[PDB]
A paper describes a structure:
These proteins interact with both RNA polymerase (RNAP) and the pathogenicity island gene regulator (PigR) to activate FPI transcription. Indeed, while most bacterial SspA proteins function as homodimers to activate transcription, F. tularensis SspA forms a heterodimer with the MglA protein, which is unique to F. tularensis. Thus, our structure unveils MglA as a new member of the SspA subclass of GST proteins.
The structure was refined to final Rwork and Rfree values of 17.3% and 22.8%, respectively to 2.95 Å resolution. Each MglA subunit harbors four β strands and 8 α helices. Indeed, similar to what is observed in SspA proteins, MglA dimerization is largely mediated by contacts between one region from each subunit. The relatively low resolution of the structure makes the precise docking of the malate molecules into the density ambiguous and isothermal titration calorimetry experiments revealed no binding suggesting that the observed protein-malate interactions likely occur only at the high malate concentrations (2.1 M) used for crystallization.
Author numbering:
A (entry chain B): 0 to 143, 152 to 205
B (entry chain A): 0 to 147, 152 to 203
The structure:
């Protein structure tokens, strides 16, 4: 019924795949890195300007902005909730999602590209280290057994890509490290991480 | 008690002000570009990262992305509904709204930029002109496919402002179809639209 176009190590794809896993959604997931799916790649380029990844296409429409991929999924698949149920927290959450998107996710992708001036990269990593603890801190504050939230899920993926890019979390706090280790341990997260593009 | 930080000739501000108009919410609009509201501007610069415009301010929060603004306004004034109320339809509508946002709204803001290059001004105009009519048709098709038409949706309101701004930026509306012309004129002379553009 539903189609998700993905790439093997895209934090965005990983996020949308986890969200689809947690929801009861069943969607065909296609990795356009693989030749075996070249047809799908061709199609992707037709239905989006740059053949963006990830793209979620219902039969009707196709979307590549993360925020509205998440929104569309949340409308099609209401349960379980990815967002707060009350307008203040829900709105502030939406702003936060946009913030994490600007600061960490986009930058993680920027880091993946090999054209980048090494020093330039080093800046980006450094900024990320600068804001990671504070961001994690707002996300826990907004959280105030509990359901997983879209912000916590995304931040789990952020910590996981920090690990991938050999970036070390700047905290001495014991509890924070226990918490981050605890996030990285969720079953769906690992389930998603094990199967790279699907 | 709402407070909408706007600036003049901003398509987003106008869209939102009409949203509030329609919702019947009474909100204090503030033109941040105006000198007499400089204090307000200062305040905005505290509660927002980059002096974001528009920004809606409630007793509880401030929000600034258009999707997020329409969202909050709806949470606090759900009736009448801007989006469909059934999941599938509502989803398509959000996606289509994002499309109009990327293709049109954002590009209109681009064309207003004071440092605008001529090459990219032409790129943008040509892009928009090339797509506007098929986009408009997608909107009316989605409209009439399942619904059902007394009250208006966000897609139609926004496409009305896109047309209005095509005019405001001296871009010819590329159609000769007499039906579509009639429809566009009907859109452009809808009560709340005129009430919105001529009371600023």
């Amino acid at each position: 019924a539903m189609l998700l176009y993905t790439k093997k190590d895209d934090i965005y794809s990983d996020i949308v795949r986890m969200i689809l896993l947690i929801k009861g959604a069943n969607a065909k997931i296609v990795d356009v890195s693989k030749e075996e799916n070249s047809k799908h790649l061709e199609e992707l380029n037709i239905i989006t300007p740059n053949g963006n990844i990830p793209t979620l296409s219902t039969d009707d429409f196709a979307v590549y902005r993360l925020s509205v991929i998440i929104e569309a999924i949340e409308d099609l698949y209401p349960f379980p909730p990815m967002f707060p149920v009350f307008p203040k927290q829900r709105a502030n959450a939406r702003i936060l999602l946009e913030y994490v998107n600007k600061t960490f996710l986009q930058n993680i992708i920027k880091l993946q590209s090999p054209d980048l001036d090494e020093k330039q990269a080093n800046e980006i990593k450094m900024l990320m280290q600068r804001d990671i603890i504070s961001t994690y801190k707002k996300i826990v504050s907004e959280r105030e057994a509990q359901n997983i939230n879209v912000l916590t899920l995304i931040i789990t993926f952020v910590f996981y890509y920090f690990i991938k890019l050999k970036i070390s979390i700047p905290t001495k706090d014991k509890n924070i490290i226990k918490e981050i280790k605890e996030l990285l341990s969720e079953p769906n997260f690992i389930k998603t991480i094990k199967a790279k593009g699907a």
